[PDB]
Design an enzyme around this catalytic site. Structure first.
Site, mmCIF file in Angstrom:
data_model
loop_
_atom_site.group_PDB
_atom_site.id
_atom_site.type_symbol
_atom_site.label_atom_id
_atom_site.label_comp_id
_atom_site.label_asym_id
_atom_site.label_seq_id
_atom_site.Cartn_x
_atom_site.Cartn_y
_atom_site.Cartn_z
ATOM 1 N N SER D 131 0.823 -1.199 0.000
ATOM 2 C CA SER D 131 0.000 0.000 0.000
ATOM 3 C C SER D 131 0.864 1.259 0.000
ATOM 4 O O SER D 131 2.070 1.228 0.255
ATOM 5 C CB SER D 131 -0.926 0.023 1.211
ATOM 6 N N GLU D 174 -2.630 9.290 5.087
ATOM 7 C CA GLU D 174 -2.244 8.494 3.924
ATOM 8 C C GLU D 174 -1.591 9.321 2.819
ATOM 9 O O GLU D 174 -0.686 8.788 2.152
ATOM 10 C CB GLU D 174 -3.457 7.719 3.394
ATOM 11 N N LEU D 243 11.983 -9.147 -16.927
ATOM 12 C CA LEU D 243 11.710 -7.920 -16.182
ATOM 13 C C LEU D 243 12.363 -6.698 -16.812
ATOM 14 O O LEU D 243 11.864 -5.578 -16.646
ATOM 15 C CB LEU D 243 12.177 -8.067 -14.732
ATOM 16 N N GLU D 245 12.485 -6.036 -20.003
ATOM 17 C CA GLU D 245 11.655 -5.596 -21.119
ATOM 18 C C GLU D 245 10.553 -4.641 -20.671
ATOM 19 O O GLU D 245 10.106 -3.801 -21.460
ATOM 20 C CB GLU D 245 11.067 -6.818 -21.822
HETATM 21 N N1 LIG Z 1 -6.989 -2.788 -2.836
HETATM 22 C C1 LIG Z 1 -6.641 -3.095 -1.591
HETATM 23 N N2 LIG Z 1 -6.274 -2.092 -0.719
HETATM 24 C C2 LIG Z 1 -5.916 -2.391 0.551
HETATM 25 C C3 LIG Z 1 -5.908 -3.704 0.997
HETATM 26 N N3 LIG Z 1 -5.521 -3.700 2.293
HETATM 27 C C4 LIG Z 1 -5.279 -2.422 2.665
HETATM 28 N N4 LIG Z 1 -5.529 -1.600 1.596
HETATM 29 C C5 LIG Z 1 -5.383 -0.135 1.550
HETATM 30 O O1 LIG Z 1 -4.074 0.151 1.979
HETATM 31 C C6 LIG Z 1 -4.040 1.354 2.708
HETATM 32 C C7 LIG Z 1 -3.168 1.137 3.934
HETATM 33 O O2 LIG Z 1 -3.569 0.004 4.674
HETATM 34 P P1 LIG Z 1 -2.546 -1.209 4.972
HETATM 35 O O3 LIG Z 1 -1.826 -1.633 3.715
HETATM 36 O O4 LIG Z 1 -3.317 -2.370 5.551
HETATM 37 O O5 LIG Z 1 -1.484 -0.660 6.056
HETATM 38 P P2 LIG Z 1 -0.192 -1.546 6.440
HETATM 39 O O6 LIG Z 1 0.655 -1.745 5.204
HETATM 40 O O7 LIG Z 1 -0.588 -2.875 7.040
HETATM 41 O O8 LIG Z 1 0.636 -0.642 7.485
HETATM 42 P P3 LIG Z 1 0.219 -0.559 9.040
HETATM 43 O O9 LIG Z 1 -1.092 -1.272 9.272
HETATM 44 O O10 LIG Z 1 0.069 0.898 9.409
HETATM 45 O O11 LIG Z 1 1.295 -1.192 9.891
HETATM 46 C C8 LIG Z 1 -5.472 1.707 3.077
HETATM 47 O O12 LIG Z 1 -5.801 2.937 2.473
HETATM 48 C C9 LIG Z 1 -6.319 0.593 2.500
HETATM 49 O O13 LIG Z 1 -7.407 1.153 1.806
HETATM 50 C C10 LIG Z 1 -6.280 -4.720 0.126
HETATM 51 O O14 LIG Z 1 -6.286 -5.889 0.509
HETATM 52 N N5 LIG Z 1 -6.645 -4.409 -1.169
#
Ligand SMILES: Nc1nc2c(ncn2[C@@H]2O[C@H](COP(=O)(O)OP(=O)(O)OP(=O)(O)O)[C@@H](O)[C@H]2O)c(=O)[nH]1
Ligand SMILES: Nc1nc2c(ncn2[C@@H]2O[C@H](COP(=O)(O)OP(=O)(O)O)[C@@H](O)[C@H]2O)c(=O)[nH]1
Ligand SMILES: [Mg+2]
Ligand SMILES: [Mg+2]
EC number: 3.6.5.-
Lengths: 491, 424, 155, 423
Positions: D131, D174, D243, D245
């Site tokens: 993320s 974020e 990778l 390419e």
């Molecule tokens: N598309 C998608 N987005 C996700 C998913 N899980 C989390 N997100 C998005 O990722 C963003 C951050 O959340 P996470 O990735 O869970 O945070 P993290 O990487 O675990 O970091 P911390 O929990 O703070 O330790 C949020 O805005 C969510 O909307 C997923 O499974 N699919």
């Protein structure tokens, strides 16, 4: 690239000379054993006579910065250097047709001349070159002889008479030399001798023998000269020359003995469960017994029974008030009894005090730190330097910032000689710096910001160049914070 | 980030504290003997947070409070070791709680805190309940907080501090005590829920139509609020899950971490309204200042951040719509320079006695109104220097009052700055 | 940077490694420090196949550098008759001027490239064009004792 | 020939599950690892006992999510040493992911990567899933990418970032986390596919016909589009077979390495033509990042068809779009659409809301309109950093405040880099 200073291909030697010239800017003032271009000066004597004009010039500017990196202590081995080096420098550096190859060779000789006690040994070595085939060499090295004089001069010269004869001897032939330059630049050397003890002497020894037209020009040159017969001040000083009623203490006053002052109801009162018992007990012997006096008894007085109960409270006592009034007692002892707390006393309260910097109440941090400053100003850096580092590594955030601020306080009053190889240098990079970086890289900003001063108060003491190694490993972003304090901080 | 250590200090501390344990023991299906008689896994999913038996430490200089807890309903469940109590009381003297008598006992408390923390898989932080106008809950609590802050600096500190009001006790030294305590909380805690007795009386008197509210009546509103704000922490859920994440999305400036809590619907002691509220109705108890547990008007300031917790079975689609609605239809009341500052979360398990409910945690700059009231009362008292010999006699310096006075006023100014701030 | 490797190749004259770098999408008009495209460099050092390779991949035939030098300037200076006609055929600027006021005809005349002089002339070079000091290509032949060039300039 | 996948934070980990679920269906691999049936061993290794193990590392600073991996359908597929968890999460704070918490586990993670790279003979590089807004996803990844540029510096690294979207957003900060990682991961990434969770939300509400999508909904759709990009590496196609390419075809500027991916068709489970699906690749509604390519210049463009496709239909649909739409290119581009085809049908999950389609396409196009996405983050960032809001959290976890500005300037410089190319 180390042994490549003698490689066959020229462009690989040209590297080694640049590599060296970096080394002598960027390496240690105290100096790495790798800086062994002193105890084998045949090396650079070889490099100065490089078979390639471009890689030669680069060896001379490496020798030049070497030969000024050596204005740090102890290099009494500059006698050997002038013997080994200036004959190659004169013979083939001054000789050179290259603008820059020559200019740096003269500068090198300058730096070897002021390494010496006087000018004679350098003068005596470069005199023979006046009798060489090539005119532009004698043209040049008479100019170089003349400006080791106009900027230094004859001082601390054992037998000046013997020296004046030795440099006056060729001046007749030089002034009748075919080359225009050799002549023109010999009248300058004449003036620079007159400019120091002429002209009665030079007219008895040398003016008589020159062409009449010549001695006219020399007289015309002396009128244009203004300033006393020997110059009042030299335009350049030597090594030793450049560096070149007691006051009374009020401490003489009679001592006062406080053991007799203490009361019977003291030990149970300080070791009591009721806080106000302890406070009053401490507060009384402080306000009634210590605060009045101005000098405690040095002779035959053991306070290490009283001081170890001040520590017991400063460390462990739950009453912050009883701590405050105790650390002020500790300070009073260290202050009114200067030169007592050698080890047993200083060490009995030192590590308790550093533990209690954890206290954040302004009044209490005031008293604890000021007492730590007392034990330091009469025991610095006996036990504190080591133990202060220990408690910078401690888990409580507050003790980190306060014990680091403590090292900063102490470092500003670091005036212990010397002049080198003190306790600070023995453990500088190994411990002090490794521990100050732990503060500089802390999670908290207020912690990090104390490290930034405590590193800029460190550089100030021990040279922003020596510590440029862990400076590089640090963020460019933290660097300019460290430099911020370096520009403001004083010792 | 799993376990939370709970602390309750002073009379009020143990009152609303025990009430809180009563509420969430039921919600999690624990009986007074300490045995699970629930019927859902969503109840024991995150029971490890507050329980092992509660992870609760009980503190008071007043020894009587001991028995008022154990003789209560869920008084049997608390660990006997975790009771730490002094011989005499502080008697509304903050200095006695913070410097003299409360300081003597604080070590014994930290020993138990250590014991409970020692056996935690991964500690989150701490949770202290206390009143601010007292001597013990305020003076010893704030001293306990600092003492933990320095022993556990890698952890969160979360307080449920209740503000004194003349409407609930006519003791005039409370402005002193609460001012001195706020001077601590602004420096020592990550997040603080401001429970205002002024607002608890005004809700029990005007909204619930009880002519003489008791503490029990005010404590009912509190315990229900606490279970509401801790709903995220106690049940599975994506948003505002642990203490640190909550504070990260709630506190934009370290000193401005004083939340104005409020929740809905407001019920009396064991009454039932026989008609469950709709989602848009609950949502419209946010700006409704008659639901704020702090005596402040959100209309008179701006929200920096907001957390909404909807409890019960309801349309996640409708809640999203209503929250997205109420934000932009009052766009001038939410700070513009913090985008997506309001956050909503839903829990399917409703609170006790209600089909639906909604709690509204808000960092609103209006909270400056609360600190204004405390400071004016403090200054009126302090300018005539009344009752100062109490505090100074216990080792305090007159200067401290000036610093706490000034420091609270800086806190008020800061709130006023960000209220008048613009994105432009 | 892939645009900098294409300059290194086009200059030193590795015909094959231009095709490699260009197959990796290197900037055909990538500028060095002084604004010289690879077409400049190949036209200076006489790499005919590299010129035609870059031109058909869309090299700016009339690109100038920091001193107003087109590739036709540099080809006519060094005397690369093969490249001069390739550039001109790809729409080169026969009467381009550079910062010193010279046209390609000035440079080919100064360097005695009589064969290139005639080619430029027949592509409509300005025989009366002047430089900064005010001298034509014809004045240069008068000043430089080149009667072979004076006759070729009045043809 | 081998490629290693890395999954950081819940986002990476949970999208990882969806991708390796979908990889194992496409390769007929069983949940226990067996196979009743090379090009596909780019991604999987092999046990002596006929078992096919992914070349993957799962990382999270917190058990919960990865705990569900190793007590789920595919618990047997991964070796337990591949699934790495800490205890304290980053709490939506890049500083904790990068500085405070991330340093406590970075060495264990780098070590477990070495064990997978030691099994490999000709390692290509790394695929990285994470993320933006997450603390772990932002901070730890950017740290891991820095350290992979040392310990494996002479090889490729590809990103699969999840661009944030208020509809599923868990944190206020974020924007901060997005900017901070994109600054520090810019120099260490060769190519990076952004996934706007808003577009994936929009698509699932429109074409999958879901009122309030869950993460499973979004991840499944995402995994389908990730599979379309990695299909060339797993089945030995003609285009994008390794990778490097990806950079050759899509990256004509080291910094500007952020392709827009467009995927058609997304058919609810409640057939189209080759021409119809290729027109949908130039419809914004089916993009993975919400922007308008019509407002921008194309630096490159690849079409990855898979299924029942006639190579001539493609050339017709290309000429249709190259003539009957005005796709503006930059002048210093080949301007020719690169193509590759893989005749195997798009696999869906049994039970999935996504239907099995006869043919499908995924267009990867490095358009300058994707700068619009950076502008939206940069703006949100500016509002909060104007008041230094939430900054104390970051600064109090080992981060210098300056790093905010240095990152913002690098994002402003990147917005200028997109502008100068497109003028
Ligand atoms: N598309 C998608 N987005 C996700 C998913 N899980 C989390 N997100 C998005 O990722 C963003 C951050 O959340 P996470 O990735 O869970 O945070 P993290 O990487 O675990 O970091 P911390 O929990 O703070 O330790 C949020 O805005 C969510 O909307 C997923 O499974 N699919
Ligand atoms: N809401 C509530 N407030 C209380 C309660 N008991 C005391 N208070 C308030 O707390 C303040 C008195 O402090 P208290 O906790 O009794 O003193 P302590 O025991 O020394 O901490 C006054 O403002 C009271 O109004 C209670 O049970 N509920
Ligand atoms: Mg009490
Ligand atoms: Mg996470």
């Amino acid at each position: 690239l180390e042994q490549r200073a003698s490689h066959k291909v020229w462009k690989a030697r040209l590297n080694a000379y640049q590599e060296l010239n970096n080394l002598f800017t960027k390496s240690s003032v105290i100096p790495n054993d790798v800086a062994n271009y002193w105890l084998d000066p045949e090396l650079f004597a070889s490099y100065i006579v490089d078979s390639n004009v471009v890689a030669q010039e680069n060896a001379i500017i490496a020798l030049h910065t070497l030969l000024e990196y050596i204005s740090q202590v102890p290099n009494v081995s500059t006698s050997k250097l002038r013997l080994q080096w200036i004959p190659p420098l004169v013979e083939k550096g001054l000789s050179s047709s290259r603008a820059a190859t020559k200019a740096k060779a003269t500068d090198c000789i300058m730096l070897l001349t002021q390494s010496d006690t006087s000018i004679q040994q350098t003068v005596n070595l470069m005199l023979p070159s006046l009798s060489n085939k090539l005119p532009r060499l004698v043209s040049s090295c008479v100019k170089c002889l003349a400006t080791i004089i106009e900027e230094f001069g004859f001082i601390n010269v054992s037998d000046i008479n013997i020296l004046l004869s030795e440099i006056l001897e060729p001046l007749p032939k030089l002034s009748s030399h075919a080359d225009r330059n050799v002549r023109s630049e010999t009248m300058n050397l004449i003036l620079q001798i007159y400019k120091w003890f002429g002209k009665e002497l030079l007219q008895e020894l040398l003016l008589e023998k020159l062409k009449p037209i010549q001695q006219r020009d020399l007289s015309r040159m002396f009128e244009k000269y203004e300033g006393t017969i020997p110059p009042k001040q030299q335009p350049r000083l030597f090594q030793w020359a450049v560096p070149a009623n007691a006051v009374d203490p009020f401490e003489l006053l009679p001592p006062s003995v406080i053991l007799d002052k203490f009361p019977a109801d003291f030990q149970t009162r300080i070791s009591s469960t009721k806080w106000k018992d302890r406070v009053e007990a401490l507060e009384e012997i402080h306000n009634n017994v210590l605060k009045p006096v101005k000098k405690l008894a040095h002779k035959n007085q053991d306070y290490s029974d009283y001081l170890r109960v001040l520590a017991n409270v400063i460390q462990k006592d739950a009453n912050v008030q009883a701590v405050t009034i105790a650390a002020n007692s500790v300070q009073l002892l260290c202050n009114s009894l200067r030169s007592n707390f050698t080890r047993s006393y200083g060490a009995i309260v030192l590590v308790p005090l550093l533990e209690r910097t954890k206290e954040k109440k302004p009044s209490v941090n005031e008293a604890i730190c000021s007492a730590l400053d007392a034990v330091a100003t009469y025991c610095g850096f006996d036990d504190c330097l080591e133990e202060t580092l220990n408690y910078m590594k401690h888990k409580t955030p507050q003790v980190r910032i306060e014990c680091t601020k403590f090292l900063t306080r102490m470092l500003q009053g670091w005036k212990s000689d010397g002049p080198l190889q003190n306790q600070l240098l023995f453990k500088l990079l190994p411990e002090v710096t490794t521990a100050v970086l732990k503060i500089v890289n802390d999670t908290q900003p207020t912690t990090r910001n104390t490290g930034f001063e405590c590193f800029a108060t460190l550089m100030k003491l021990v040279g922003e160049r020596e510590l440029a190694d862990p400076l590089e490993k640090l963020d460019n972003l933290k660097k300019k914070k460290i430099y911020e304090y370096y520009e403001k901080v004083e010792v | 980030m799993r376990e939370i250590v709970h602390i309750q200090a002073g009379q009020c501390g143990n009152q609303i504290g025990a009430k809180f344990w009563e509420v969430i023991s039921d919600e999690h299906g624990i009986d007074p003997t300490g045995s699970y008689h629930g019927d859902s896994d969503l109840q024991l999913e995150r029971i490890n947070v507050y329980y092992n038996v509660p992870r609760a430490i009980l503190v008071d200089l007043e020894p009587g409070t001991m028995d008022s807890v154990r003789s209560g309903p869920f008084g049997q469940i608390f660990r006997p070791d975790n009771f730490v109590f002094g011989q005499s009381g502080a008697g509304n003297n903050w200095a006695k709680g913070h410097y003299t008598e409360g300081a003597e006992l604080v070590d014994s408390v930290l020993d138990v805190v250590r014991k409970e923390s020692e056996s935690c898989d991964c500690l989150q932080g701490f949770q202290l309940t206390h009143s601010l106008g007292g001597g013990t809950g305020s003076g010893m609590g704030t001293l306990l907080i600092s003492k933990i802050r320095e022993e556990y600096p890698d952890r969160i500190m979360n307080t449920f501090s209740v503000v004194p009001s003349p409407k609930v006790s006519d003791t005039v030294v409370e402005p002193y005590n609460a001012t001195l305590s706020v001077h601590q909380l602004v420096e020592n805690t990550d997040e603080t829920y401001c429970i205002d007795n002024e607002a608890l009386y005004d809700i029990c008197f005007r909204t619930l139509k009880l002519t003489t509210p008791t503490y029990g009546d005010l404590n009912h509103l509190v315990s229900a609020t606490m279970s509401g704000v801790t709903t995220c922490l106690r049940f599975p859920g994506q948003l505002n899950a642990d203490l640190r994440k909550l504070a990260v999305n709630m506190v934009p400036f370290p000193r401005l971490h004083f939340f104005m809590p409020g929740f809905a619907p407001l019920t009396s002691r064991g009454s039932q309204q026989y008609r469950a509220l709709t989602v848009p109705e609950l949502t419209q108890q946010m700006f409704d200042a008659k639901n704020m547990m702090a005596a402040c008007d959100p209309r008179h300031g701006r929200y920096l951040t907001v957390a909404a917790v909807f409890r019960g079975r309801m349309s996640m689609k409708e809640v999203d719509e209503q929250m997205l609605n109420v934000q932009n239809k009052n766009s001038s009341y939410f700070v513009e320079w913090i985008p997506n500052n309001v956050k909503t979360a839903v829990c399917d398990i409703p609170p006790r006695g209600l089909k639906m409910s909604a709690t509204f945690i808000g960092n609103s700059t209006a909270i400056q109104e609360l600190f204004k009231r405390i400071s004016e009362q403090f200054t009126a008292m302090f300018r005539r220097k009344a009752f100062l010999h109490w505090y100074t006699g216990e080792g305090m310096d007159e200067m401290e009052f000036t610093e706490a006075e000034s420091n609270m006023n800086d806190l008020v100014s800061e709130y006023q700055q960000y209220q008048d701030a613009t994105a432009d | 940077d892939l645009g900098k490797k294409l300059l290194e190749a086009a200059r030193a004259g590795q015909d094959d490694e231009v095709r490699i770098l260009m197959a990796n999408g290197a900037d055909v008009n990538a500028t060095d420090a002084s604004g010289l495209t690879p077409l400049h460099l190949a036209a200076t050092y006489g790499h005919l196949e590299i010129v035609e390779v870059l031109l058909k991949h869309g090299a700016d035939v009339n690109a100038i550098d920091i001193m107003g030098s087109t590739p036709l300037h540099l080809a006519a200076l060094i005397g690369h008759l093969e490249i001069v006609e390739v550039l001109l055929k790809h729409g080169a600027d026969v009467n381009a001027v550079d910062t010193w006021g010279d046209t390609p005809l000035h440079l080919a005349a100064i360097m005695g490239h009589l064969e290139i002089v005639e080619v430029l002339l027949k592509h409509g070079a300005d025989v009366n064009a002047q430089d900064k000091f005010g001298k034509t290509a014809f004045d240069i032949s008068i000043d430089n004792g080149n009667e072979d060039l004076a006759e070729i300039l009045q043809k | 020939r081998e490629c290693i996948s890395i999954h950081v934070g819940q986002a990476g980990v949970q999208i990882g599950n969806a991708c390796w679920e979908l990889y194992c269906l496409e390769h007929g691999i069983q949940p226990d690892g067996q196979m009743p049936s090379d090009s596909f061993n780019t991604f999987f290794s092999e046990t002596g006992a006929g078992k096919h193990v992914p070349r993957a590392v799962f990382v999270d600073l917190e058990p919960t999510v990865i705990d569900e991996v190793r007590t789920g359908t595919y618990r047997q597929l991964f070796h337990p040493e591949q699934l790495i968890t800490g205890k304290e999460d980053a709490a939506n704070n890049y500083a904790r992911g990068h500085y405070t918490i991330g340093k406590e586990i970075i060495d264990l993670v780098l070590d477990r990567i070495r064990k997978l790279a030691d099994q490999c003979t000709g390692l290509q590089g790394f695929s990285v899933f994470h993320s933006f807004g997450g603390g772990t996803g932002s901070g730890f990844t950017s740290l891991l990418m820095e350290r992979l540029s040392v310990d494996y510096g002479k090889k490729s690294k590809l990103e699969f970032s999840i661009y944030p979207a208020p509809q599923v957003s868990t944190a206020v900060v974020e924007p901060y986390n997005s900017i901070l990682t994109t600054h520090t991961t810019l120099e260490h990434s060769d190519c990076a596919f952004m996934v706007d969770n808003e577009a994936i939300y929009d698509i699932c509400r429109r074409n999958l016909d879901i009122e309030r999508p869950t993460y499973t909904n979004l991840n499944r759709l995402i995994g389908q589009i990730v599979s379309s990009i990695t299909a060339s590496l797993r089945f030995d196609g003609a285009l994008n077979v390794d990778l490097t390419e990806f950079q050759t075809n899509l990256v004509p500027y080291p910094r500007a390495h952020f392709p827009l991916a467009t995927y058609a068709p997304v058919i609810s489970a409640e057939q189209l033509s080759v021409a119809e699906i290729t027109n949908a690749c130039f419809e914004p509604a089916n993009q993975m990042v919400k922007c308008d390519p019509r407002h921008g210049k194309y630096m490159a463009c690849c079409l990855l068809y898979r299924g029942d496709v006639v190579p001539k239909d493609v050339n017709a649909a290309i000429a249709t779009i190259k003539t009957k739409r005005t796709i503006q290119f930059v002048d210093w581009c080949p301007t020719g659409f690169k193509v590759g085809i893989n005749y195997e049908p798009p696999t869906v999950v049994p039970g999935g809301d996504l239907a099995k389609v006869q043919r499908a396409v995924c267009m990867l196009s490095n358009t300058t309109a994707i700068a619009e996405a950076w502008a939206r983050l940069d703006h949100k960032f500016d509002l909060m950093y104007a008041k230094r809001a939430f900054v104390h959290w970051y600064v109090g976890e080992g981060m210098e405040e300056g790093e905010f500005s240095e990152a913002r300037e690098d994002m402003a410089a990147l917005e200028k880099d997109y502008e100068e190319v497109g003028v």
